[PDB]
Structure 1
Amino acid sequence: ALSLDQRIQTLAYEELNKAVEYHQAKAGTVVVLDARTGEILALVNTPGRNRAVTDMIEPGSVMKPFPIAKALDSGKVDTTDTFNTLPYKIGPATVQDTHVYPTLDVRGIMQKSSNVGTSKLSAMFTPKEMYDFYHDLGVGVRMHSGFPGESAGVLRNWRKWRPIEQATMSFGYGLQLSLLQLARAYTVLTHDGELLPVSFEKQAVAPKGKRVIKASTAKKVRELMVSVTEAGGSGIAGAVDGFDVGAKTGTARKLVNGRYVDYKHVATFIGFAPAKNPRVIVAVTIDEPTANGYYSGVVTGPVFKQVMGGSLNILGVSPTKPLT
């Protein structure tokens, strides 16, 4: 039997279509995963191929939790550690934030989506250490979901990395993943540090995962990510009434469309809830929005909010705080 829940599939389809129409976008995808099993509860695309598995993107901001997790897991960084987050140079290249802050701690780096802060955390590790970590998350790795045309994405050999490329990878550029690979990678955060296999078939036994970080680290990262959907957070448009939600949002770049070259901006939102004890991962992409907003949170947050809220309701999960 398929793991897909027709109620969630219908909800995802309707909310996706609503956003694609409103923002006059080219295409879109929603993936909903069981956060503790890797089973696909919904997977919808606009008409055409199964872009969730075929289309790889440079993920942008949604990748940031991972170098943060690696840094915390290593013991080299504490959540309260503060970093100089002013723009800086690597050779002639500049790494800078959208909103400039002189200093941020790790919670702030997550909350504000700081490219500088994330790059500095990554810079504490060798190219090999970072590559091995990204590889362990499934970047450049086949999922073997049994979907046809499944992209492995791109993770360049660390032996070829320049310092600027290590830096840009930490904030989601210079490596490429499909939306389903991104959703899968988020299971390290939701399933207490263990990467789950992805399946569209109902699983008869407990899927065993590969441990990537400690469970304590995964828990701390989920906590940090709640700041993204609270006041002051880059992902407020994706807050879900009655729940705490860990999430990231940002603009990804599509360089490959099917079997062809491309260059498109893709609004992205991915997250999980309830944040302390997650049941669901929802991931959303909308390709080339051209109306009523072009910043990613406003385009995709509302899709995430409705799909997440509705999925939790459908599965019977009680709100953890009174509704506003």
Structure 2
Amino acid sequence: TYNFLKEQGDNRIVRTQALPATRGTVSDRNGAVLALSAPTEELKRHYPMGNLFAHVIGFTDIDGKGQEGLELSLEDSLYGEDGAEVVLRDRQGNIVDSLDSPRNKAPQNGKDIILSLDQRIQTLAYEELNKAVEYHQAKAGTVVVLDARTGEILALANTPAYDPNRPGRADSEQRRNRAVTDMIEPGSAIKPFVIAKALDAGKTDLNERLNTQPYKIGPSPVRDTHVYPSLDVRGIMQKSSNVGTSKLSARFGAEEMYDFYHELGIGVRMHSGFPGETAGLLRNWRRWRPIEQATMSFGYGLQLSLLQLARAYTALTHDGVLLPLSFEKQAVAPQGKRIFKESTAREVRNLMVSVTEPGGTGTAGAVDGFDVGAKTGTARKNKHVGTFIGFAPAKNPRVIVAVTIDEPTAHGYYGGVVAGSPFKKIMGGSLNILGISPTKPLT
């Protein structure tokens, strides 16, 4: 009797055998392989580049289902469809016959994805980030680099990280994708937008001189670090004047300001495609006092993730049009949402260059051969969080770099010193990597 016609016994056992799909591969924008599957001694996931892209890509569970990062969120297109076949086997595991069955199915492999991220920029961001964190004895740190013209993410790293090839020994603090999951107070980093809105609506202009003496809203004082009797809009930007900023904001009602912050993306989920997105914090305007509106104008009382912060800056770099962010490689810039006039964005960019020049509050982030528009700040959580964010070449921007250092312990606290050195190295490096020439003679 032919073996397939027989009753089963100890040595002929009907068995449905899985034919596993192979999971899609993840590559960087130039083709470098970041994630792939190999047959195991079932498939196994390999991350050839180790902890470099840990938080972005995330990892997979023992059954090859996405568990964190883009492995989780792209799980549907990445997994494929396992196949199967019915076989007779012997008690030693040898396939003895292949049986006809409507259950015999070929596997469908997963879709490959090409990220927008650039291994060279990721490496530079990764290196400079850890140098800063280790030097300042900080708790943690985050970097985001964007294409100022397309919204494509070029790099995104956080420290501490973990090896995604060995995710089972990774701490909760290690696994957290801070750029995406963590709310911060922007502090001075919001001021450019307040100024731009005032300019865009015509509530101020480039000639107006504001009285910027410290004042009080009821009992609560509003003051700068130094007394400046009067500043124009350029000086308000340059000196990072709380007084000037809150006065310009106070020329708008609470609802108008709220709708503005909201349309920049504050208080809602980005829906970027990453899992674990924070919604941030924007309190309903109906609950606002004048003091709260004013403190928001200099970046307290409202919160967003560093990735939200960096995205807001696309309104400034992409000629007043706010872009959605991309983790996948784009052929062209996506349609955005117009927020400012092109005319307004150009002048505000011009103003921000003054922050990084001798008279400004963030000279630590100046880059040889380039005009850099930037803001810098430090918010309390004592324990602090230093931020530095900016773009270059300021007239025709190409890159946005955002950096936060969390609880620096040694060699300062201020974000300009602390988050300013890595910002400068990462920005300079990135401009070099992208082959952008200097616009002014090098020192």
TM-score (norm 1): 0.96
Which one of the candidate residues 231, 245, 252 is aligned to 2:372?
A: 245
Partner in structure 1 of residue 344 of structure 2 = 217
Which one of the candidate residues 102, 107, 118 is aligned to 1:5?
A: 118
Partner in structure 2 of residue 123 of structure 1 = 250
Q: Is the 8 A contact 1:169 1:175 kept in 2?
A: yes
Q: Is the 8 A contact 2:266 2:308 kept in 1?
A: yes
Partner in structure 2 of residue 309 of structure 1 = 428
Q: CA deviation at 1:81?
A: 1.1
Q: CA deviation at 1:206?
A: 3.1
The answer to whether structure 1 residue 33 and structure 2 residue 152 are counterparts is: no
Letter in 2 for 1:320: T
Structure that is richer in helix per residue: 1
Return 5+ residue gaps in structure 2 as ranges.
1-113, 161-173
The answer to whether structure 1 residue 283 and structure 2 residue 402 are counterparts is: yes
Q: State how far apart, in whole Å, the 2-side matches of 1:71 and 1:269 are.
A: 23
Q: CA deviation at 1:264?
A: 4.0
The answer to whether structure 1 residue 19 and structure 2 residue 132 are counterparts is: yes
Partner in structure 2 of residue 259 of structure 1 = none
Q: State how far apart, in whole Å, the 2-side matches of 1:264 and 1:70 are.
A: 32
The answer to whether structure 1 residue 161 and structure 2 residue 288 are counterparts is: yes
Helix, strand or coil: the match of 2:374? Answer: strand
Q: State how far apart, in whole Å, the 2-side matches of 1:206 and 1:145 are.
A: 15
Q: Is the 8 A contact 1:189 1:221 kept in 2?
A: yes
Which deviates further from its counterpart, 6-15 or 76-85?
Answer: 76-85
Q: Is the 8 A contact 2:150 2:332 kept in 1?
A: no
Q: State how far apart, in whole Å, the 2-side matches of 1:217 and 1:175 are.
A: 24
Q: State how far apart, in whole Å, the 1-side matches of 2:136 and 2:324 are.
A: 33
Q: CA deviation at 1:296?
A: 1.6
* CA deviation map 1:48-88 (0-9, x unaligned): 21100100011101111011010000012002211111111
Give the percent of matched residue pairs that are identical in Structure 1 and Structure 2: 84
Q: CA deviation at 1:205?
A: 4.3
Q: CA deviation at 1:231?
A: 0.5
Which one of the candidate residues 266, 274, 296 is aligned to 1:147?
A: 274
Helix, strand or coil: the match of 1:149? Answer: coil
Which deviates further from its counterpart, 37-46 or 136-145?
Answer: 136-145
Runs of 4+ in 1 over 3 A off after TM superposition: none
Partner in structure 2 of residue 45 of structure 1 = 158
Q: How many residues align?
A: 316
Helix, strand or coil: the match of 1:13? Answer: helix
More RCO (CA 8 Å, sep 6+): 1
Which deviates further from its counterpart, 195-204 or 169-178?
Answer: 195-204
Q: CA deviation at 1:265?
A: 1.6
1:37-76 pair list within 5 angstroms? 37-47=150-160, 48=174, 49-76=176-203
Letter in 1 for 2:148: A
Helix, strand or coil: the match of 1:78? Answer: coil
Q: State how far apart, in whole Å, the 2-side matches of 1:165 and 1:193 are.
A: 26
Which one of the candidate residues 176, 186, 191 is aligned to 2:313?
A: 186
Q: State how far apart, in whole Å, the 1-side matches of 2:331 and 2:370 are.
A: 30
Which one of the candidate residues 297, 302, 314 is aligned to 2:416?
A: 297
Which deviates further from its counterpart, 78-87 or 184-193?
Answer: 78-87
Letter in 2 for 1:18: K
Q: State how far apart, in whole Å, the 1-side matches of 2:343 and 2:186 are.
A: 26
RMSD between aligned residues: 1.0
Helix, strand or coil: the match of 1:42? Answer: strand
Partner in structure 2 of residue 232 of structure 1 = 359
The answer to whether structure 1 residue 323 and structure 2 residue 442 are counterparts is: yes
* CA deviation map 1:169-222 (0-9, x unaligned): 000001001000000000000000011001111124430000011011000000
